[PDB]
């Protein structure tokens, strides 16, 4: 007994293991287990492809499950490693199944860099292998029927999922075998053979003829359509066509023979005869034209036995008129069969190797979130610092809070003395002098590291060129020049980072040189400092003066405001939200992840309380600097312009400017120091990367 099956497609073996491992290492921390388990699995994958595909050999469910196991593992991997995004050079090469092309060759191949192409072929082979196992089954047997019926319906569903997946995934024209019309015809043949099987079970289980006639008729309807599809497109092996034709006929005859047992049961004798004659015609034709592909003898002997006896009984006894075919009611149809939907996992006991691996969808989103968090936070920080700077500069340029605390011109105003002690307490000028001294050394330490590193490259390159010049034959490997261009481009970049640092060093140094001497004064013991501040005869309207208490409370409000910026900045920086989860969720319940909208709404939840206040500071400062200047310019009427007070004025203005500068400078110097300190970390790893590559080579 002959059933159609499909042969596997062939593939050249490819390096799955290495292109994948590249991404893995360039995404997680080198030396950790989030780099470990995703290399142990990447190798097990590469092996598993070879075992599933690497040979057209084994012909049972061990090898089918390995294929199925392989299909599910591929499908599971797609949302990880960026395949959709193109920069992975994994190219899959498959050969036509049928040696068919829409061109006059003997074979044709397609090699594509597309996981979608890969997965279709794997599934075709799953379909095909299942077909071969089904065709092999022993059909006089309950497990034979059941295994074939399940495998044909799988093959039919597998081929149909291929029909609806190919053109989208694969962004080329597929080979003829995995082409929609082919794979759609194959799906229907598999469905048909699955009916055949159920028609065979009903026969073996001695079910009612009415039933069997209807199952045979359904099969015949399925085989006819498959036949038609084939009449004007020769895309399948040469044996498919005549087998479809014979099976179509045999199933019409089985339908007619069974319905003929009905007609007899109902004393429709002319109909018995007409239907039997039809069964005889089809089988006679099948026996002579398709003798290579079927054996139909018993059934022929059984038709004729039944027919002679009906004609004996009719001619003598009953005398029933034999109708034309055209006048007979259609035999019904009953399907007991379905194309099996493909839904991973199709393998049993499936386990996902890269289950723990976070999807790319999240990575991109999680990264892009951080660049939006970063803008919002620096945004807010820089705005505030710019403001406090500008407020301090205005208060200095107007001798405040000093002026309104300047009882006589005899002593050190309380605020100036307060600022002084803060400077003395933070170490004084020694702290600024020491940081300025060590800055060129931390610079030099970084130049040292960059040069020694590139020198390694230079020295290895020179000997590599000499060896290739002297031993042309004995020394053939890619030149050092080409291997080193990546590292040498990190190098030229680092250089530019250093060019920027130097200029910044310049800025701090000039400001340091421009303000040293006034700071040194500020740091002097209180009576010593008072001696260097010129005395003046005070403008004595400064007892209960109303213009004073307005400035006084106004400066308190300005003080409040700027002191508050400090707890704001710190809260802006100390908080954060791990967003992986909110991303994970939107991925599983929705089609895709839209981070923009999802992150905006969460950055408003986490940071909105603080961004509001940051804004309520800037504007509040604006308001305070408005009616501090228009208020001050009135206070200035109470003070008169003479030489002794112009002098004290400037010294006071300049001592306050000095405190501002000491504070700014300490912050700048400690910023430069941490920078040159983090940069050594960057550069040591670069120096290490240079020696590893100069010694691996």
């Amino acid at each position: 007994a002959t059933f159609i099956s499909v042969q596997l497609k062939k593939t050249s073996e490819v390096d799955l293991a290495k292109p994948l491992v590249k991404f893995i290492q360039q995404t997680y921390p080198s030396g950790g287990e989030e780099q470990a388990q995703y290399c142990r699995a990447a190798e097990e994958l590469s092996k598993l492809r070879r075992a599933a595909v690497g040979r057209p050999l084994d012909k049972h469910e061990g090898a089918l499950e390995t294929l199925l196991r392989y299909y599910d593992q591929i499908c599971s991997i797609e949302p990880k490693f960026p395949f959709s995004e193109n920069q992975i050079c994994l190219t899959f090469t498959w050969k036509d199944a049928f040696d068919k092309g829409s061109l006059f060759g003997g074979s044709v191949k397609l090699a594509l860099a597309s996981l979608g192409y890969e997965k279709s072929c794997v599934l075709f082979n799953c379909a095909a292998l299942a077909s071969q196992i089904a065709a092999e089954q022993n059909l006089d047997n309950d497990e034979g029927l059941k295994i074939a019926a399940k495998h044909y319906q799988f093959a039919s569903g597998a081929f149909l999922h291929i029909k609806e997946t190919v053109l989208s995934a694969l962004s080329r024209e597929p080979t003829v075998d995995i082409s929609p019309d082919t794979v759609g015809t194959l799906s229907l043949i598999m469905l048909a053979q699955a009916q055949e099987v159920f028609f065979l079970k009903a026969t073996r289980d001695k079910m009612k003829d009415a039933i069997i006639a209807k199952l045979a008729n359904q099969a015949a309807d399925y085989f006819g359509d498959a036949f038609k599809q084939c009449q004007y497109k020769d895309t399948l092996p040469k044996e498919v066509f005549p087998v479809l034709a014979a099976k179509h006929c045999i199933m019409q005859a089985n339908a007619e023979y069974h319905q003929s047992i009905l007609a007899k049961q109902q004393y429709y004798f002319g109909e018995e005869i007409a239907r039997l004659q039809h069964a005889a015609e089809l089988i006679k034709t099948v026996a002579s034209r398709y003798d290579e592909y079927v054996n139909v003898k018993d059934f022929s002997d059984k038709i004729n036995r039944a027919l002679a006896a009906a004609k004996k009984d009719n001619d003598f006894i009953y005398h029933d008129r034999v109708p034309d075919l055209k006048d007979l009611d259609p035999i019904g149809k009953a399907t007991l069969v379905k194309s099996t939907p493909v839904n991973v996992p199709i393998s049993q006991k499936f386990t996902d190797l890269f289950e723990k691996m976070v999807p790319v969808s999240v990575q991109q989103s999680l990264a892009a979130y951080n660049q939006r968090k970063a803008d919002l936070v620096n945004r807010s920080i820089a705005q505030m610092r710019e403001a406090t700077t500008l407020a301090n500069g205005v208060l200095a340029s107007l001798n405040l809070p000093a002026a309104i605390e300047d009882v006589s011109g005899d002593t050190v105003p309380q605020s100036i003395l307060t600022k002084s002690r803060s400077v003395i307490e933070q170490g004084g000028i020694q702290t600024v002098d020491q940081l300025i001294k060590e800055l060129p050394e931390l610079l030099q330490r970084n130049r040292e590291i960059l040069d020694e590193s590139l020198r390694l490259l230079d020295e290895e390159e020179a000997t590599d060129n000499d060896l290739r010049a002297k031993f042309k034959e004995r020394w053939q490997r890619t030149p050092s020049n080409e291997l080193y261009k990546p590292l040498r481009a990190e190098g030229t970049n680092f250089r530019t980072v250093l060019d920027k640092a130097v200029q910044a060093d310049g800025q701090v140094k000039e400001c340091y040189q421009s303000h040293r001497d006034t700071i040194v004064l500020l740091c002097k013991p209180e009576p010593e400092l008072n001696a260097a501040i010129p005395s003046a005869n005070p403008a004595k309207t400064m007892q209960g003066s109303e213009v004073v208490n307005v400035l006084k409370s106004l400066l308190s409000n300005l003080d409040e405001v700027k002191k508050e910026r400090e707890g704001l900045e710190n809260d802006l920086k100390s908080v954060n939200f791990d967003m992986t989860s909110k991303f994970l969720t939107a991925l599983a319940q929705d089609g895709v992840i839209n981070e923009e909208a999802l992150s905006v709404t969460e950055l408003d939840r986490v940071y909105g309380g603080l961004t509001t206040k940051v804004q309520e500071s800037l504007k509040k400062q604006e308001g305070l600097l408005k009616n501090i200047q228009v208020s001050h310019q009135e206070f200035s009427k109470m003070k008169q312009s003479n030489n002794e007070a112009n002098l004290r004025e400037e010294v006071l203005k300049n001592l306050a400017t000095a405190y501002d500068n000491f504070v700014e400078l300490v912050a700048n110097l400690k910023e430069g120091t941490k920078f040159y300190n983090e940069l050594t970390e960057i550069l040591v790893r670069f120096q290490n990367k240079c020696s590893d590559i100069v010694f691996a080579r």
Binding site: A382, K500, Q507, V508, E671, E678, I682
Partner: peptide
């Protein structure tokens, strides 16, 4: 602020 960006 003053000193260049360290990110990569």
């Amino acid at each position: 602020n003053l000193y260049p960006d360290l990110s990569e």
